[PDB]
Design a binder for this molecule. Structure first.
Ligand code: XYY
Ligand code: CL
Length: 289
């Protein structure tokens, strides 16, 4: 559509913010709060509805992992509950294929999920599909050529450089070439024929490095690093440019929004979020009201 939507996130506690950024004019709008605060969620769009998926409410009244799927209609500026997932999934990744949402990995307490389930908007129903070969939380997910990729994350013991691909018509996961960098809570998206993995956490440092996987060559190649180190960033694509939003640099919960131009191989500062935050869900759709 036209706007980059950021939903939820974390600063001191989980957040309920929904705000939309307009690349055309640099403006931010605050829209209807989520019904429940959540960090570690993912955002996606299907048929002009924005979806907030999974996460956890980290609050002083207690911490609760979320199995929620909530539906935002930009036409009405209202959130409605949609069907809940089979399980809570904090630090989730999601991908859309053929109008269906795949919820991938994430955690529930000390449970690190390998499980994957698929939502059908037409039926408001989730169904489990084949689990990943690896347990992954903080998992990056992208879709390219109607195949679903799960990239990096944390399996309960180790942060991962591994990645795998789901073939829907085979209901089967297979490993792909591992990344050159261990990344948990990277931003993962697709641009042209490539899966990008930006930033993340390796268990010691937050990362500025960025690498991309070419499905034709099966190789990962580093591109220019981001201006900021960041883990638990939000990421999206708007008109052939990658945007990264917020995250944590080991010192600050960033308000920084950076954009990548693949033609010049450069990252630039674009705007600041209205306040610093990590673990947001991000997606692109039409302007509201
Ligand atoms: C920080 N957020 C939660 C979160 C954590 C991690 C990972 C998990 C892991 O590798 O164990 C993580 C853990 C600790 C980190 C880290 C990343 N970066 N710095 N530090 C100290 C990945 C994604 C998300 Cl969304 S949130 C609460 O904002 O949603
Ligand atoms: Cl968390």
């Amino acid at each position: 559509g036209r706007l980059i939507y950021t939903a939820g996130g974390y600063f001191r506690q989980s957040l309920s913010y929904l705000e939309a950024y307009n690349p055309s004019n640099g403006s931010w709008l605050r829209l209807a709060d989520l019904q429940v605060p959540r960090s570690g969620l993912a955002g996606c769009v299907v048929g002009g509805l924005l979806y907030a998926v999974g996460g956890r409410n980290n609050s002083p009244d207690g911490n609760t992992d979320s199995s929620a799927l909530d539906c935002y209609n930009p036409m009405t500026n209202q959130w409605s509950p949609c069907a809940s997932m089979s399980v809570p999934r904090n630090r989730i990744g999601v991908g859309v294929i053929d109008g269906h949402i795949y919820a991938v990995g994430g955690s529930h307490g000390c449970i690190h999920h390998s499980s994957v389930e698929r939502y059908e908007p037409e039926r408001d129903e989730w169904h489990l599909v084949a689990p990943m070969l690896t347990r992954r939380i903080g998992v990056g997910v992208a879709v390219l050529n109607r195949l679903l990729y799960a990239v990096g994350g944390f399996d309960g013991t180790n942060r991962l450089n591994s990645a795998e691909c789901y073939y829907p018509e085979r209901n089967e996961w297979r490993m792909i070439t591992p990344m050159n960098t261990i990344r948990s809570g990277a931003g993962v998206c697709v641009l042209h024929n490539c899966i990008y993995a930006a930033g993340g956490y390796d268990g010691q440092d937050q990362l500025n490095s960025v690498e991309r996987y070419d499905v034709e060559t099966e190789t990962w190649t580093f591109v220019a690093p981001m201006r900021h180190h960041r883990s638990a960033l939000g990421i999206t694509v708007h008109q052939g440019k990658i945007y990264v939003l917020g995250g944590y640099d080991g010192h600050t919960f960033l308000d920084s929004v950076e954009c990548y131009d693949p033609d010049s191989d450069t990252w630039s500062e674009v705007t600041r979020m209205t306040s610093g935050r990590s673990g947001v869900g991000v997606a692109v759709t039409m302007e509201p009201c």
